[PDB]
Symmetry: D2
Subunit: 393 residues, 4 copies
Amino acid sequence: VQPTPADHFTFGLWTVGWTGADPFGVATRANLDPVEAVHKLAELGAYGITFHDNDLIPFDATAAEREKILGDFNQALADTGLKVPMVTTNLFSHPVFKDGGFTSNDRSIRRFALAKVLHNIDLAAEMGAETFVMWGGREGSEYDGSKDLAAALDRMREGVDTAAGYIKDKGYNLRIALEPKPNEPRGDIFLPTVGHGLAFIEQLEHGDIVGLNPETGHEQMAGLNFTHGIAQALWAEKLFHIDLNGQRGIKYDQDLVFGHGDLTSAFFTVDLLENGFPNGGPKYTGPRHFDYKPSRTDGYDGVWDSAKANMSMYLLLKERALAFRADPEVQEAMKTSGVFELGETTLNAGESAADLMNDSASFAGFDAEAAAERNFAFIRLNQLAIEHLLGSR
Amino acid sequence: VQPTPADHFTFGLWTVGWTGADPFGVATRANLDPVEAVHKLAELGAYGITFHDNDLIPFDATAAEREKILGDFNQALADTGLKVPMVTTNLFSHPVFKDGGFTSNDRSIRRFALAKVLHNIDLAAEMGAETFVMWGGREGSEYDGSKDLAAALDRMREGVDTAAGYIKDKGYNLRIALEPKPNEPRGDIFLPTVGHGLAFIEQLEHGDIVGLNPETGHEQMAGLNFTHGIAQALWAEKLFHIDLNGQRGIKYDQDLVFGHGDLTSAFFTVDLLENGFPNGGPKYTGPRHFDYKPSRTDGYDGVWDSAKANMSMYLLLKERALAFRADPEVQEAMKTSGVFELGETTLNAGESAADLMNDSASFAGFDAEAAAERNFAFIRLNQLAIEHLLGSR
Amino acid sequence: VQPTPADHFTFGLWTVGWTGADPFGVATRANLDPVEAVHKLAELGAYGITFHDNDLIPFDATAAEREKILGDFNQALADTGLKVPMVTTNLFSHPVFKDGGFTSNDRSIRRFALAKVLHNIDLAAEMGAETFVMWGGREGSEYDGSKDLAAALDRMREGVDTAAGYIKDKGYNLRIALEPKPNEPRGDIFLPTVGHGLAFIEQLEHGDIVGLNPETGHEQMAGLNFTHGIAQALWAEKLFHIDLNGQRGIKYDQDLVFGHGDLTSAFFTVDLLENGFPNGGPKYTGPRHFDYKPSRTDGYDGVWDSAKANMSMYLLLKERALAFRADPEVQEAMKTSGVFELGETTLNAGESAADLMNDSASFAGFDAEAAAERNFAFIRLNQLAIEHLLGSR
Amino acid sequence: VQPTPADHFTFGLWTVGWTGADPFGVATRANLDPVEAVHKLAELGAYGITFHDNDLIPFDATAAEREKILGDFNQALADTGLKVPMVTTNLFSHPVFKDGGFTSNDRSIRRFALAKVLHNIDLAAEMGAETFVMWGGREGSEYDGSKDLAAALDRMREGVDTAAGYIKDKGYNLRIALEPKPNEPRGDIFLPTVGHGLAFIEQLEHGDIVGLNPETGHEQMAGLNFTHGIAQALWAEKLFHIDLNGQRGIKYDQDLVFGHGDLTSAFFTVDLLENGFPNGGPKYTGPRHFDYKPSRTDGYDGVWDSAKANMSMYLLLKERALAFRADPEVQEAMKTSGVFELGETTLNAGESAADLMNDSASFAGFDAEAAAERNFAFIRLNQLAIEHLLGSR
Ligand SMILES: OC[C@@H](O)[C@@H](O)[C@H](O)[C@@H](O)CO
Ligand SMILES: OC[C@@H](O)[C@@H](O)[C@H](O)[C@@H](O)CO
Ligand SMILES: OC[C@@H](O)[C@@H](O)[C@H](O)[C@@H](O)CO
Ligand SMILES: OC[C@@H](O)[C@@H](O)[C@H](O)[C@@H](O)CO
Ligand SMILES: [Mg+2]
Ligand SMILES: [Mg+2]
Ligand SMILES: [Mg+2]
Ligand SMILES: [Mg+2]
């Protein structure tokens, strides 16, 4: 398995650039030059790179510094052919953002935050990015009386609709992707799961250009099924981008390599991304982005190894998932279990509620004890998927 | 503290009627006669009672049996004055519902399930209920390949829109409330949290009459903040009903008495229900329903005690929450922390995006290190709330 | 892969015999006759069967009836050659055990529970079991003030030490194994994890014949690493029996087939049971017992599919774990990462604390910054294990 | 409630001194001078201060510098009267400890870590500390094949037994206390809970002077009951020190003020530390140490507010826990529920196992169905505790 640019594997500058500081220790690695990151990733087979404004341009950068850095990074992009499909803003590291950007209780800070986003849209637009991600990491609270929860959602909405109105006004070819996270760094974060992000988009004035950017480990930090959550996003046609990594349980966000967390869930996520729904429906078509962090125990050989492991894991899972659905035994097990039967509408063509209540066969004369005898054989279908994942089939 | 019918405390027949069987043991209590439940609850100060069709009418009940039971229960209601504000359907106990009702993979079963709901709407309508709850407990999977996830949401939608169309057609004065749960009895349940239920309603043809019925312990089984979740439901004007109980962590659904789980979260939920949002906004106005189970260790004296503890807990929390917001020290702490400041729009009246980017004060000349110096004093506001909850203030 | 009796796969009568009642529904399958259970297990290649006293003999059975049941049961064992390696007692289903067996607050229930246990030991010895398991499923509380926590531990010890002295007194060749569970059916169970069970055994008077029976899903309900937990039990030489199954996360105990939960963790569990430790040490040589439940959506074909599947999964993982450790690339990866280096003592033969203190190259003269540059290459090592797991290496 | 030195409230230098860097941001507060820390703690009523070697003396400090820092530090202690009851070592921040101190895969890091510890013991003794705490924060792994799990336990034991023999050899009046943590910063930490720490101590050669230092938030990260866990440590008489703080659920370690996490559990923790066990037994008489971090959104006023708040919370709970146990209605509720009955031995003085077996009224003649009717009244008992907690009784 060898990734080619046709695979659409994208990486953030902050992933291979993550230096290693965590809550109990300092960096274990020297900073990564952005020019090097770009060359290195292009040599491994990446398709693109993504960044936060401050990953590249320091917060306090003078104008001359910004131009230099941008000339160096654009040179690197020209030399290697990497695309920049997504750009995001850092509204969480500077001390000013301690209570949030968009939903900070201080209004002057909310204004700076939105100003900082608006300027970043311009940059995003000039880099040719198709997606603009918003991860509101500091949007939340540690304590329940810190916020007016209705006002917090109004403030979030104001910021997101202002950013979207500006895109439309400027004619930029960008969509906004919101990225949910249940906690960390705040005790509770606003719009904690895929459902909460999707719900919120529906209250927006400009929701047509707003969708989601779900991350594997974020959903698993609430103990949810990542595959079920991205399936709901898909079904509502709101799956704009995806962040792939691994997580080993409900705890701090590990950011492991994709497939290095819950393996069977990783298998079924790849199947959904590659094979789509068994009865048909929308398919996800954007980048396969890896938002992970190389363990701080490992030196730079490990960094490149970890980048490579992401693409290898995905390609290996993909091979198994295509083999799995192509197997005739699996197709037969699917039919037996009623997977295709779920796709037939419950009612008949032009059958109303009144018509159904009235059908004796469906209710009054329905044999419930006889229907309950069906062996759905879900265990057997599960055994067949796992044997295909282990390559023994 | 003494609950009066003016408090609007409602109880399901299945809560005080829960006999005690769990996964590792049989019932520890004799069945409860429905007539007795009604009299007993009216003597404690309940306002109303709620039930599942099969809580009252056995699954296999003949016509003569159904009429008898309904005559007995309506007599009881007439004698005591209890209301029946909510009615729900049991789509989870019979073996026929092993793969779901609405999203069972077997189509004949989906038809029976919907037929069973339609008939129950009639009953609900005749009892004078304002709310019809749907809890899809068997809607989900243990294994990721058991379902076509897009088809499962189509099947759910078909059932919910059919039920809603029927309400409209019949002219019934009922709204449907969907009730999320992340897991148990299925490994993963569809529409696992408040966000997922709200998202789903937006894809519905008849979503205008569809809202939510969140339960305290269900949200806490995913480790979410119950108060933040009901605040999002409120803000979207979808909080139709509420299920109150207690939960002590991420584990099986305990169904403890309300306030017998996370106490501080219970305190802030009561504040939200009674005081509303600090800057104003919608207020929840329906029943305060308790969906709990009297621990199986306790005899019938304990059952009535537990029913009474629910209303006492709520009334005690309410007293403290009204005291808390009326305290001048708390009002001052709120202002200091920026709780009211969150309520001011970020932009000025007729200030566009372009106008803001352009304001030098907001961005280019903004002093970020100086803004970051504000002491938000959230800890102190948290200390004041807890001292009010402990009654030491 | 075809299991054979030399593989030492054992199954509980209650696993395949679980009819499907859960907290929200009744059984979906007919009761399984235990003579049939024995014949079917033996045809599939199991080596032995285990049971709870009340799995085979009803709680109400007369002596005549107990003799009758046991003669047919022993006949079936004789007909097939299945061993009975472990016997256990049901101290959780009858309403009498609602506050516990050994730690019930009621003294007369404690005496009844201990007498039930002692009689069961006599049957255990009579069947040729080498192990007597104790799962204190109802030992615990929902509420913190329900028990004196020190008296509960004194009553647990009295119960286990009386049973242990009785084995010793009668000279049975039996060992007691305690089985920890964090919760379910109690809100909090005493001795919730492997560590608590191990610690508790060291306070017993007859500790020498008391060890543990860890269960995969139980440590995963506290988000613990099952391989790390059983490693600690093995290190202490207290791993007397093991229960294998699957769990997808912190939620109710699912009891899925082994390998249908956390797959990568199942791989490393199999590596420790089969291969042991990289530098050498203890090895577990007991039976490989499956304590799971066939999903309620499936009929009896699914029941035997599911029993087969446990054995398949273990042999597939066993195979990939042998290939993995045998691989020269893996052995060199382990060497680079310092796996064998951890096996060397920190101190030199005869070096004292004073000596080390005083050795300037280990402290005063140590180059901590040089030492920190080591690439441990843990990411690469993990990528090698998963490629062996996925059958690509 | 005003704390006074007799209350024995102790604080770590790193608690009030935590500047706010978390995984997604930099410090929000200026470094706290430790002489100032001492003066401020003493003004608020603390009894003592604790510190990690590198909290006071930089890792790079010259001997001259170490002497300088220590003279001002000892002067401040002398000026104020604060004791130094516990001392600990930092074996986690420097990049050298990226794979652990005692269990690092690198042998030369293991020697450096042990020498760092031994020197620190000398300082501990010199300061008059009675307790030396060991938190093995980096002892663990992200991946299961990174370590030989048996060698890791041998290296942990070598390290703790060398330090213990050195105390014994020098005759210091010091005890070692191990502090368990399930995860963070390692994906899995060795000795993850109270039970694992207790079990581990029983395999040490110098076990007699080794006990535990449980931390509220750490057991709550595995969803365990902190009162049950510390009850087991106390029962074994291994509760040598305690770390008090708050945690809202299974997620990253929050380190909130004691009482700002699970309030009801904090109430029962305070009851066990202050009141002990209902039937009598061991009591914890050590210092009440606060291991928390002031939230990063707050300035230094919030820092001293937060330190005050820990002491307020403990005295408010202490007060309500004394009122609770003193209450004659509670004492009768406890009596009904069998709390004192659990304190009676199961067996009669001189009754053997044979005797009990053979006592027909405890088994053959037992009315199990009669016995099961007992109302244990646990719900009522819990309602009484919360009404005392809420200050309504
Ligand atoms: O939890 C961190 C988060 O996942 C971060 O890497 C976001 O993805 C980024 O801020 C937006 O792309
Ligand atoms: O988890 C069980 C669920 O909470 C049940 O009691 C629903 O609320 C009821 O089916 C609808 O009202
Ligand atoms: O949670 C159920 C438990 O795992 C049970 O099946 C014990 O293993 C059995 O009682 C002892 O063998
Ligand atoms: O998770 C941090 C840990 O709780 C730490 O502050 C230890 O308590 C300290 O290192 C030993 O005292
Ligand atoms: Mg991300
Ligand atoms: Mg409910
Ligand atoms: Mg078991
Ligand atoms: Mg600590």
